[PDB]
RNA sequence: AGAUUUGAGUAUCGUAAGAGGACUCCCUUAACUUAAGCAUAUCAAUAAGGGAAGGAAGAAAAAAUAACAAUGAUUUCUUAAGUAAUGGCGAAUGAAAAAGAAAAAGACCAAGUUGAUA
RNA sequence: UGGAAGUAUAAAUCGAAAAGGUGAUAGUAUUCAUCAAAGUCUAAAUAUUACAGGAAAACUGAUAGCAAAGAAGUACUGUGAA
RNA sequence: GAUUCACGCAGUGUUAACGUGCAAAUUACUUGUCAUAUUUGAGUAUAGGGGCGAAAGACUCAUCGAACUAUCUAGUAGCUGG
RNA sequence: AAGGUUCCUAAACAACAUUACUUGGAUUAGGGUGAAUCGAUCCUAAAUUACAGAUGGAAAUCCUUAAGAAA
RNA sequence: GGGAACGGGCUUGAUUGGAACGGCGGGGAAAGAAGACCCUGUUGAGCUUGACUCUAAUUUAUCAUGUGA
RNA sequence: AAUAAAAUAUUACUUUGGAUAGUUUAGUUUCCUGGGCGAUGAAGAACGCAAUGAAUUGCGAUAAGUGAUAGGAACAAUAAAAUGUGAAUAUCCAAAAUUUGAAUGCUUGAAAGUAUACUAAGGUAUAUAUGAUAUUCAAUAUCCA
């Protein structure tokens, strides 16, 4: 799916928090805010460079 | 579920209704022995009653309509409860008929020159 | 060599693939001889006249056009009326 | 006192309950609807909003009228 | 409020009949994963935003 | 008083609205980016915003090509072709006749004529 | 706009015809070639990642594949868009 | 729009407590103030190159020398890590 | 105002209230909110929104009695 | 001592019994934070100004045919 | 010099955890056919209905279902009743279809409501724009007596 893992809204939280510059996802009120994002190495995020149809 | 379908096809109209009084009034009491701790096969005539009321129902409606329709089927404006069955758009489109109308000119070279039938000889 | 690209504009959008080409041939051919099943002259792909092509470069070739004129119907003795139903193409 | 302390005032009601969507999302002020598009007759629909479309569009629902209709 | 509309508290009430759990005949069921009701709150847990 | 003209209220029979917008026809003067900076240019009929429909829609019957031993409505595919051309002629942008195929179909208004005129 | 002394649209002004347009280097003239604008409809060949019903696969095999293989846009967060 | 005390309010000092706190700004004593340029509830009005400001670039939902949220967007990186 | 069954009773204490609990605003199950005179409903205040009209490429904006054979 | 010129580990020596309690604040160049001072990016943003190129508002001339001298 | 409580090392078994292996009623892509909504009230939202249901599913005051046509003996967690004189099950069918929603007599915040006409209650109609016809009018607007 050409959607698939960038389904989201993320930014990077950016440096002076002592965590990663991955991009984070957004809200609260779930275990999914705050963690990775579209990235390859992360998890639930999109893989390298996806196959395509053509 | 002890009513039947014959039982009730068999009544008047006014014995549609004077059956469904019984059976509403009847139906009235069971709910109280149901609050007031009725034995299982009280709640049993329950369930019972009320599918009676709706077949009571259905034939006591479906013969009216039935009627109904004989009265308008000849009336020049008939009610839409009682038209045929179609979508919005099918009551928009034009007729098969106006769809195929022609005009005289083009209508009389339609029937002078025709598609003829052939072949070629190889 | 000096590279000519012209992919800077989002081609992904305007990538078009024929993955419908060997479906496209089974429908064409069923509309065919279904086409002759209704009327077997229908698909005879009425007759077209011998013209030239256009230009020097090709001013030696004959190829098939469209209808003929009024004047060949007329050399030929057809009414141009009737042309168009035995299977004759007329380009007035 | 902008943290903690500011917290306590907050007993009045921005948004309530809307007729057209069921969300509490009709603005009392405002008399209008921050996700259905109340009184304006469209639904209030939007390209960037791809999911609020997923969320609330045809299909979402019971669709009691126009499952027999594509049945039919 | 002491005071509400009639609309408001119908759905008030709906809201105390949802705060249910699942019925123990309802478990004894054949093949049955329901045992709890995720969908429980309670006063001083959760606000339910209405 | 009467013959007309225009504009209203009421009654009857219908019509529009809203959902969907993957594909179709359009309105609007975005920017990030590229140019190793940047201001025209590129990104780019692109994003977002707005309107309208169908099962397909749009186009369609030359005030069209061509300069030939000439063609001939519209649509789509191959080729022409990253070519002619456009561009701080920088970065970049960039068609069309011919030629080969899929399918083929042409009909009307207005103007003119006929008026014991309908 | 590829259209370069203007390819197309629009606005201000101006504004034709005992017709005329085009032949992309502006201008006048004479020939030549080819059409006849400023009204309308028109099937077939073409597109489709809405949605519905099917069939396939050198696709993934529960941190993978749709966010969702269980009452998944559900639990939960925010005044709200989200 | 005098001087003070009280119910309240603020936040001058201790640069006290606490500083993985009762608290993402609080506590104790001390100090100032404690009705007309006063304090305060609800309703209502003003919205992002906008608003409001007895003016500190202050406040605009713990976010302000330009809010929050979604899309362009996997923005670009001659720089850092793998 | 906000909360929404937290109110009362009974059974029961696995979890929760930085020990423990026979206690509980915690678990389970029932019960409980009675109006001609109290309020909403009625009136208008700051302000707010419609038909027609005016404006705008557009969504939409303006006007609230002025423009209207309307109110 | 040498070493990236201030070692817990290396070299040579001084010296060492295993487990630890209450204190304290020398060291661990202690923890908290991809330095905020400085510099480099052909990286930005607020503000100012006859910096360059523009623009709303303002202004001026012509056009858009009311009649009679 | 000395012990092995602590400390360390390997193996076996147990524990916390859920990797690995086997598996799939779930997805992804392509292709084929259609692309069938709504004032005859749509899509969406709310409330309600199972003998014991909180969700979910199905349904709408005829309620986890009614009639008709096919269908032939079940359902089940526990009781009941009904049942080849027809149980489950299925459908482009019929009757029925609460409050809202373009929402359309007027108002609507979380608002309880309410006016007229027709056939005390119940049920219909009454929004805006609009095409055609009928009808009642307004304007010395053009004539004309």
């Not at chain 2, 007729?95 to 020159?113: C, D, E, G, R, S």
């Not at chain 5, 093949?31 to 339910?48: E, P, V």
Request: with cysteine.
């Amino acid at each position: 799916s050409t959607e698939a893992g960038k389904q989201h809204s993320a930014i990077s939280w950016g440096t002076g928090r002592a965590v990663a510059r991955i991009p984070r996802i957004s809200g609260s009120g779930s275990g999914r805010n705050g963690q990775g994002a579209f990235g390859n190495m992360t998890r639930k995020g999109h893989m390298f460079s996806p196959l395509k149809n053509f | 579920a002890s009513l039947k379908i014959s039982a009730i096809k068999a009544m008047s109209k006014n014995d549609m209704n004077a059956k469904l009084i019984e059976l509403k009034g009847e139906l009235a009491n069971l709910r109280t022995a149901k609050v007031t701790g009725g034995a299982p096969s009280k709640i049993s005539r329950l369930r019972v009653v009320k599918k009676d009321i709706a077949r009571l129902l259905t034939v006591m409606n479906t013969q009216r309509m039935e009627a109904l329709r004989k009265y308008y089927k000849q009336a020049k404006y008939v009610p839409k409860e009682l038209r045929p069955k179609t979508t919005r758009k099918e009551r928009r489109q034009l007729t098969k008929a106006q769809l195929n109308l022609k005009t005289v000119k083009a209508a009389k070279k339609a029937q002078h020159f025709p598609a003829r039938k052939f072949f070629v000889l190889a | 060599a000096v590279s000519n690209i012209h992919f800077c504009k989002d081609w992904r959008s305007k990538v078009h693939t024929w993955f419908k080409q060997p479906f496209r041939k089974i429908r064409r051919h069923q509309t065919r001889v279904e086409k002759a099943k209704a009327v077997f002259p229908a698909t005879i792909k009425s007759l077209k006249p011998s013209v030239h092509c256009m230009n020097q470069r090709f001013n030696y070739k004959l190829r098939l056009g469209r209808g003929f004129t009024l004047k060949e119907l007329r050399a030929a003795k057809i009414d141009k009326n009737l042309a168009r139903t035995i299977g004759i193409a007329v380009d007035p | 006192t902008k943290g903690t302390s500011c917290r306590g005032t907050r007993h009045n009601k921005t948004h309530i309950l809307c007729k057209r969507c069921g969300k509490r999302s009709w603005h009392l002020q405002k008399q209008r609807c921050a996700s259905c598009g109340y009184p304006d007759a469209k639904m209030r629909q939007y390209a960037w909003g791809y999911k609020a479309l997923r969320r609330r569009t045809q299909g979402t629902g019971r669709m009691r009228h126009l499952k027999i209709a594509l049945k039919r | 409020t002491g005071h509400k509309g009639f609309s408001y508290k119908l759905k008030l009430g709906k809201k105390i009949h949802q705060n249910r759990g699942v019925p123990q005949w309802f478990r004894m069921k054949t093949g049955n994963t329901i045992n709890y009701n995720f969908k429980r709150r309670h006063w001083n847990r959760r606000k339910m935003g209405m």
